[PDB]
Design a protein around this ligand. Structure first.
Ligand SMILES: O=C(CO)[C@@H](O)[C@H](O)CF
Length: 524
C-alpha cells in the first residue's frame, strides 16, 4: 500500500490524510492547538489582541504541532516507508518571518531532536498575523493609493486591498517593527513555511497561495514591483521567485528519513492555500463551480478569463497554472435561511421544503434580497422585496418569501460569479457542500438557476485530500499530464438534482431583472 500524504496547517489544527494509489483515504490524524498545546493560551488556535483587530498565532506552536502529529502517526503504527510523495495546504494569508541565519538551522537538522527544539530561535516575529487579522486598514489604503486605486490593485493582484492579505501585514510589521523586519532573511506563507519544514530548506511560494498577498501579478506570474515597493523595502529577496503549484520543490529532508522512516526518494510537491487545495480536492474543472453553504456562503469558481473586481478574490489556479480560480464570500447565509424559516414556515425545514415544492420557478416574478447584516458581495443591507411589476413591496406570503430568499441567493451567486468572468458551459457541474446541501429542494433551485446538474460532496478534509491528489499529480507526470486525468479514478460525488424542464427559459429572463434591481438598490 503505497501512498501520498496530504497536510493541512489550519487555524485550529494541523491535520493529515494518507491516500493510497487507488485514491482512497485510509488514514487521518490531527493535532488540535488549544487542546494539545494549551501552554500557548490560544482560543480557536489564535490570540485576539487587546485592540480587538490584531489576530495572531505563535509560529513555534505550528512547529511543535508538526512534531506531535508525526510522533502520534508513528505511535499508531503508520508505515512511513510507503510514502511516495507529500504536499499540503496552509490557512491562507498568514505569514512567517524567518530570522537571519535560520536556513543554516533548517539545513543542519539532526534526527535525534524535534523540530521545535532546533528551530527555537529561527523566527524574527514570534506571533504571526493570520487570516482573521483586521488591523491593517491604513496599510490597505496606502497600498491602493500607491498603485492607482482599489481597481488598479485588483486588476494586478486579483483582489483590492484586504486587511488579512499578506502585503498589508508585511507593511505593518516593517512600519511598527523595522528592527525585526531588517533581521528577517525570508518571509513565508503558512503553506510555504510548512513545505520548508519538510524540505529542510526554504520552499518557494506557489502561484495560487501567492495570489492572496496583494503582491503577485496574477497574469504574468511575477511579483508586482509597484506592490512590493509600496509595502516594505528589499521584500522581493525575502520572498524569492514564485513557482507553479505543481512543482516538485525537493526531496524530503534526511531528517524525516532517519527520524521517521520516510523513503529518501519521497518527493515534496509545492504546498498551496487551503481554498486552492479544496478546489483540487473537489476536482473542479473548466466550467465548474462549488457552493459551500454555511454561516457565510462561499463560492469557488474555475476561471479561464478572469475579471478582477472590488469584490471577490481571483487567484492563479492550483491545478492549471495558465488559468484561474475565484472565491466570492456572502455574509448572509445560514442565519438568514434560519430566520426566514422561523418567521414564514413555523421553524420547520420540512415546511421550508414544501414552500419550495409548492411554488413555481421564477416565483411569479416576486424577487427578494435578504441582508439583515451588511453584505459584502455586494455592499447592501436590508430586506428589499419586489413584485412581478418590479414595484417595491413590504412583504410576501410565507411560501413566496421562502422561494424569494433561496432563488435570490442562488441568482446572486450566478450574477456575481459572471461579474468575475465565469460562464455556465454544457460541461458544467455544480458541487454543493454544507448544511443546506442536505436539503434537496434547496439544491433543486440551485440546479434550476444555473441550468446545470448539482452534486453533493463532503468537504471536511477537502484541503488535505486535495493536497494528496496534487502529490499524486506530481508523481504521475506533473505539468506533462492534466490534473483531471490523474484524479478521474477518485470517488465521485452523488448527483442531487438536475435542472427542471423550462428552467433555462425562466432564468434567462429573471437573472437580468434581479441584477437590475440589485443595481437599483446600490444606487439608491
Ligand atoms: O481568509 C481566507 C480566504 O481568503 C480563509 O478561508 C483562510 O484561508 C482560512 F484559513
Amino acid at each position: 500500500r503505497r501512498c501520498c500524504l496530504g497536510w493541512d496547517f489550519s487555524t485550529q489544527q494541523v491535520k493529515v490524510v494518507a491516500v493510497d494509489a487507488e485514491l482512497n483515504v485510509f488514514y487521518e490524524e490531527s493535532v488540535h492547538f488549544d487542546r494539545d498545546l494549551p501552554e500557548f493560551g490560544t482560543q480557536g488556535g489564535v490570540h485576539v489582541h487587546k485592540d480587538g483587530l490584531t489576530v495572531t498565532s505563535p509560529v513555534l506552536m505550528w512547529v511543535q504541532a508538526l512534531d506531535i502529529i508525526l510522533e502520534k502517526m508513528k505511535a499508531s503504527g503508520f508505515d512511513f516507508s510507503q510514502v511516495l510523495a507529500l504536499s499540503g495546504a496552509g490557512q491562507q494569508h498568514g505569514s512567517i518571518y524567518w530570522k537571519a541565519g535560520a536556513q543554516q538551522a533548517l539545513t543542519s537538522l539532526s534526527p535525534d531532536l524535534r523540530l521545535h527544539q532546533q528551530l527555537q530561535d529561527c523566527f524574527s516575529i514570534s506571533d504571526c498575523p493570520v487570516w482573521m487579522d483586521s488591523s491593517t486598514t491604513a496599510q490597505c489604503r496606502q497600498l491602493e493609493a500607491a498603485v492607482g486605486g482599489a481597481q488598479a490593485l485588483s486588476c494586478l493582484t486579483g483582489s483590492r486591498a484586504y486587511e488579512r492579505f499578506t502585503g498589508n501585514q508585511i507593511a505593518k510589521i516593517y512600519q511598527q517593527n523595522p528592527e525585526a523586519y531588517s533581521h528577517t532573511e525570508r518571509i513565508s506563507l503558512v503553506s510555504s513555511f510548512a513545505a520548508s519544514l519538510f524540505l529542510g530548506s526554504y520552499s518557494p511560494i506557489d502561484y495560487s497561495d501567492g495570489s492572496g498577498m496583494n503582491l503577485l501579478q496574477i497574469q504574468d506570474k511575477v511579483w508586482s514591483q509597484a506592490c512590493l515597493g509600496a509595502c516594505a523595502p528589499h521584500l522581493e529577496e525575502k520572498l524569492s521567485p514564485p513557482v507553479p503549484s505543481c512543482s516538485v520543490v525537493g526531496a524530503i529532508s534526511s531528517y524525516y528519513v532517519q527520524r521517521y522512516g520516510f523513503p529518501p526518494g519521497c518527493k515534496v510537491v509545492a504546498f498551496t492555500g487551503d481554498n486552492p487545495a479544496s478546489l483540487a480536492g473537489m476536482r473542479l474543472e473548466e466550467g465548474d463551480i462549488a457552493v459551500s453553504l454555511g454561516t457565510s456562503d462561499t463560492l469557488f469558481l474555475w476561471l479561464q478569463e478572469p475579471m478582477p473586481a472590488l469584490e471577490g478574490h481571483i487567484f492563479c489556479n492550483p491545478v492549471d497554472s495558465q488559468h484561474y480560480m475565484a472565491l466570492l464570500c456572502f455574509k448572509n447565509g445560514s442565519l438568514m435561511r434560519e430566520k426566514i424559516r422561523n418567521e414564514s414556515v413555523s421553524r420547520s425545514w420540512s415546511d421550508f421544503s414544501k414552500a419550495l415544492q409548492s411554488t413555481e420557478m421564477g416565483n411569479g416574478g416576486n424577487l427578494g434580497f435578504y441582508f439583515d447584516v451588511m453584505e459584502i458581495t455586494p455592499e447592501i443591507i436590508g430586506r428589499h422585496r419586489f413584485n412581478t411589476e418590479n414595484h417595491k413591496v413590504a412583504a410576501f406570503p410565507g411560501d413566496v418569501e421562502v422561494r424569494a430568499l433561496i432563488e435570490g441567493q442562488f441568482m446572486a451567486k450566478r450574477i456575481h460569479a459572471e461579474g468575475l468572468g465565469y460562464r455556465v458551459m454544457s460541461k458544467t457541474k455544480i458541487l454543493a457542500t454544507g448544511g443546506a446541501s442536505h436539503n434537496r429542494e434547496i439544491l433543486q433551485v440551485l440546479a434550476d438557476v444555473f441550468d446545470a446538474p448539482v452534486y453533493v460532496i463532503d468537504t471536511a478534509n477537502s484541503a488535505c485530500v486535495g493536497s494528496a491528489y496534487r502529490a499524486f499529480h506530481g508523481l504521475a507526470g506533473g505539468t506533462d499530464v492534466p490534473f483531471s486525468e490523474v484524479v478521474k479514478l477518485a470517488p465521485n460525488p452523488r448527483l442531487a438534482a438536475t435542472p427542471s424542464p423550462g428552467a433555462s427559459q425562466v432564468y434567462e429572463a429573471l437573472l437580468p431583472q434581479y441584477a437590475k434591481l440589485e443595481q437599483r438598490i446600490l444606487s439608491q
